Symmetry: C7
Subunit: 137 residues, 7 copies
Amino acid sequence: MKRFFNRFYLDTGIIADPSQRSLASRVSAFLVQGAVAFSLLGTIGVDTSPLIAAAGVTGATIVFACKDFGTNFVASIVLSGQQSIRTGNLVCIGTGLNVVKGKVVDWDTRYLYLRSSEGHLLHVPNNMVLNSVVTWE
Amino acid sequence: MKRFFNRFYLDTGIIADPSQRSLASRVSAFLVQGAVAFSLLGTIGVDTSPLIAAAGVTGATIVFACKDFGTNFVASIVLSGQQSIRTGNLVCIGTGLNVVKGKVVDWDTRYLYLRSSEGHLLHVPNNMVLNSVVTWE
Amino acid sequence: MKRFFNRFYLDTGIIADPSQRSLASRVSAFLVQGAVAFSLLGTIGVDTSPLIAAAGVTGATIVFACKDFGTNFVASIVLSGQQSIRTGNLVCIGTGLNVVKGKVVDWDTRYLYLRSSEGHLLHVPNNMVLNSVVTWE
Amino acid sequence: MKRFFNRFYLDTGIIADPSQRSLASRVSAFLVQGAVAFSLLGTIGVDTSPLIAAAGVTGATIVFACKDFGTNFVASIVLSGQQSIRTGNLVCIGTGLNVVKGKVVDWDTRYLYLRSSEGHLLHVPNNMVLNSVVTWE
Amino acid sequence: MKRFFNRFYLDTGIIADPSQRSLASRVSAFLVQGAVAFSLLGTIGVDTSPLIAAAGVTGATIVFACKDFGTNFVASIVLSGQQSIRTGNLVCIGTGLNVVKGKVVDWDTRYLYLRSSEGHLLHVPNNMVLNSVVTWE
Amino acid sequence: MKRFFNRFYLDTGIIADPSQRSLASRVSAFLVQGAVAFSLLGTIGVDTSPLIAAAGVTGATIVFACKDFGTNFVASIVLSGQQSIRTGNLVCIGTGLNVVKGKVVDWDTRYLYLRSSEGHLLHVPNNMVLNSVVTWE
Amino acid sequence: MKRFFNRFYLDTGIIADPSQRSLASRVSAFLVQGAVAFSLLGTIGVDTSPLIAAAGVTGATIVFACKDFGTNFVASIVLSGQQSIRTGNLVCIGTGLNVVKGKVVDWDTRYLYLRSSEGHLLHVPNNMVLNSVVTWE
């Protein structure tokens, strides 16, 4: 099942990093196996309501705690392929006082790297990039 | 079922890009087939409560993670047909310090492209366009 | 059932546009027919829990994605009949830097149109109109 | 049942406008009748789970769409009887740049009307009045 | 049951106003009686699921509509006994442009009354008092 | 059960005030006894669904109303033991216009007390302390 | 089970502090044991619905109260391994007026420590670090 999940993630391009892809495949396989085991246990007569409630509460806690990380990952997934964000392109992010200017040097799944005029490295989150005005020369 | 979903999406005009329409049709067909299979499994006696809980948690996670993308897509769907946003039209978006000025050159399902006086390309999200004051000369 | 829903919407005045009224009547009729069919299927013994869960998840996704559109529509519904917002009336919306001034020329279910001193057309969303201070000369 | 709901609303003073009171009484009577009918249908054996789910989804959509209207109505209900907000009283609402000054001339369930020094009519929502500093001379 | 609820509220000090205490006691007694009646009806065989769903939806609507009022009441409950907020004490609430200065003259369950240097009466909500920096001379 | 809850709270250090600890122990004992009684009542055949729904709605209302108080209490619990916040230590909280400067004199479970240069007493909520930049000389 | 949870946490690197790891292992073991006991009790016939509802309400209260702490912990987990945040590295966090400048001296699971030009110690929460522009020389 891990191989199937890895192939699915690689084909759809959701995850490109081999380590992250392997970790996500393992997590998904474990979750599916646990769901199948819980269904089988509930079929024969075992009351699975407390287990379902505990699993749901734990999952909700994990999801709500990692909201920023998930949003940044989804923003990186969506922003992939954008023509304005390319290596060597001078872009400006934000409007007003909260403005960021630099040249794109490297792209990551959590941060967007820009090089300022003075040479400083700017780490702009993909979430900030999605919901902001992007100015490209 | 994929053909039916594609025809539905094309007729209602929700999705116009053939690739996005095909992907959405495949996703919808898979979801409907999974729901039907789960209902059939639960009819004969298999306890489908853990499977339903896991599917609901995963769906909630996916929906909450892609909130910005979904909002931008819905904003693009709603804003289609607006007379103020047309090619060659000089429009101004925002009020106060957070203001954006340019001429509409191209429209997308995620970004709105404007050409500044200096020639810079401005990428204004459709979500920003919906909930802001639009000034058209 | 579509005729009944159309008559209901026309009588209560929720929707005045014939196209929007027809679309909403069709959507409501389809939803009611689906609910009745699901209830009938569940009566004879078919496990409708997965179908109910999938329908609820899809409905929640659609509602959360169209939150801004629904809020604007409700704001337009509520603001109808206001004496301050009439054709030819000079009104001012907002306080401080985020201020909008103009004369009302046309009203829509999504935008409020104002004419500035220079002749620019201002598109103020009804949601912005509801939760803001309105100044009328 | 409509008469009972109207008498209840009039006695508790929640709604004072006869038209709004009649509409709310009709809505409440319809909702109670529908709930009773659904309970009776479910008693004899009809599976009412899909109907309950659809009704809950529709109610949640309506509640979330009318959030601003409901909040303003509740704010008007709470603010009734306040000594600072009386006809002919010069009051100031807000702090800093977002400040509003005028004399109270008329009170409504959606807006608070103030007369400026120049004679302009200010429409301050009751929600803005509740969560703001009120200065009364 | 109304007497028991009134005694409970008086002993715990949650509500001190006799009118508010009586209204809350009546509401609580009605809610408990309704819950007991619904449980008794469901025991003999009546399907109480639609009634439970309708009651839950109505309660959620009422709670969400009165969020500001409930928050202000809880803030007043918590802030009671604070040494900095006493009659005749000169206090300052807020930081930066959004600042409020005055002497405490009277305390209420919804507003905090301050007397300015010029003699104006300031109505600061208890919610604003809780989540702000308080400066006491 | 009250003694057990008091010992648990004292050992884990969640609550240090004897009055608050006693009140929380009483509340927890009452809640556990009510849950056990409801389970016993539902075992013999009594339909406990309306009671569970009413208890859940009341608990959700209480939790949502006391959100600020709970957040401040958790912030005080987390911030305990911090080396920067000690008696006699000159600390600065906030960035930009919303800045607070003073020397720590006393610590509470709801407020943080600072002494300004002029001698004024500053009441900074623990929630404000947690999510802000702290500058310590 | 405590040993298994401790080994799991140590291997995945979620928690590195031995005290926090031991506390989390104890909490997880207690939760799993309680869920298993509740399932066993519900299997033999005991109505576990009130217990499940009470446990879910308590868990939701605890999760919502510790939202900031959980978010900071997840931010610290995610930010681990970042090259820009290293000892002796001069970094700048924030844009506009809300800006923070200093050299990284020590890293914690709740705060990020920076040394200013004057020698002051700055405590920047990891949540603030994640959702902000980071400037590294």
